[PDB]
């Protein structure tokens, strides 16, 4: 009756990670087909990062200022383009380890795996959520920059995130693989406020369903509620509003457990209003919001 | 200031997982050099599992009863041996994807990554601890059997665990790669009691050091304690005794934070005796014991 926060197998992504340097600045890149992708701030020093003019900085850089490494192999560049906040470095060899892949822009509340790398070398993999305020609560030390987030469907790697910045608050911000930031953030070493963050209500519910499936059902009550009245309580505890789309998305879990989505919401309501009284759910003392309904399904069905 | 439970990159292990079937029974195997390794209970039906005579069951099985698959390739066997609770199936091709590897027997309290597979196909990776009572709190659905646990050092995969059983309580038990069970367990569908489980004290301390490093230090006090008096309290809350070896192992973390191991223990004491008072440490409301001192170092230093 086990339930673990599982990342996707990282093998397809490991063979795509490279090192990218200029000057004192090294970070991680992603080598796909004949293109390396990395944060454009690789071209900056720490002084440049206060107020970088990326256009003007990019004009001063030589191909040969960019040392792309891959293990104990150094690669060579034949064309370079800035797309938003990503640098595309066309290279002298198409990665033979290129998986089938797509680039996707995910929505707040969606999950993905991160392959944390230091210097183009994989160190670890973890599963996380994109927060409603478009930050990531990551584990990123000096030069985990350029580490990517992904989902795997069948044979296809869907790349959705590239780490760019740690905010003064210690949370992470990054871009899609076209180089557009998630959230209001910019690649400048400046004061940048994230929004109020909220809990991903639909994910919490999914995880309560996981808990029922795995045999942990003390929090079930025979109260119910409407969506509208649930959302009154939710809004008070900085939970995201739940929509009928969210209810629809929970239907397979409702079907499996014989527990109506709106009855699970009424359980959650009592949890929010009364706490856990020192009890745990799936071995956790807080309500977990980093499993989507899809994640719970995938893990419960194989 | 992020701290995540990270698994090792799984690529080296993904290219070693295969499917093994007999009858209605399929499960995961590990294909290294010219040998496939899998739980010996692959040769059993669910009826056989009450009281299997593995010697006699093994005598009735034909090579050709064993369908080893690898993606969309089926492999063929030339020799078979039972080593303890593992079957070794010598095969007609040395895995070209074989990494550098070792087989190790780990100690309770040590961590490792599991590549959860269904039918020889990787589904996910997670980090876990071997509990003091030699169970694993896993995520293993029907035929995640034969899924392996591992650590990576540099270029070398150290295989330490193979999942065999779910206990009636829902926890998992398994063997080393020589087929010796961790703990008192046996591969029979019978009533088997795990010990009282305890919390891995040294790991909790390591994680408190992680918390200090990441800026979360409300629980620091200016009390201290002796080891002997700490262990009085620990024993009351079903914490493993802390030894001078454990103190020694925490020295690098003590050095980095300027907090003496015994002062951190006195912090832990107050935590055990008073709870958290609704506060969190590293975003958790319980004390985490699945990070070793080595894990905390590796994550904090790159």
Numbering used by the authors:
A (entry chain A), B (entry chain A): 1 to 302
Sentences from the study reporting this entry:
However, the X-ray structure of MproE166V with nirmatrelvir yielded an apo structure devoid of any nirmatrelvir density. This absence of density can be attributed to the reduced affinity of nirmatrelvir for the E166V variants. In this apo structure, we observed a significant shift in the position of the N-terminal residue S1′. The substitution of the acidic side chain of glutamate with the hydrophobic residue valine appears to be the primary reason for this reduction in binding affinity toward nirmatrelvir. In contrast, MproE166V showed a substantial shift to a monomer-dominant equilibrium with a monomer percentage of 61.3% and a dimer percentage of 38.7%, suggesting that E166 affects the initiation of enzyme dimerization and that the proportion forming MproE166V dimers is much less than that of MproWT. Of note, when MproE166V was treated with nirmatrelvir, the monomer peaks of 10+, 11+, 12+, and 13+ charge states were substantially greater than those in dimeric MproE166V-TKB272, suggesting that the binding of nirmatrelvir to MproE166V became weak. Structurally, nirmatrelvir lacks any P1′ moiety, which leaves the S1'subsite empty (left), however, TKB272 has the P1′-well-filling benzothiazole moiety (right) as well as a fluorine atom at 5-position of the benzothiazole that forms effective halogen bonds with amino acids of the active-site cavity of MproWT, playing a pivotal role in enhancing TKB272's binding affinity to MproWT. Regarding the role of E166, similar to our findings shown in Figures 2 and 6, previous studies by Duan et al focusing on the molecular mechanisms of SARS-CoV-2 resistance to nirmatrelvir and ensitrelvir show that the E166V substitution results in a loss of one hydrogen bond with nirmatrelvir.
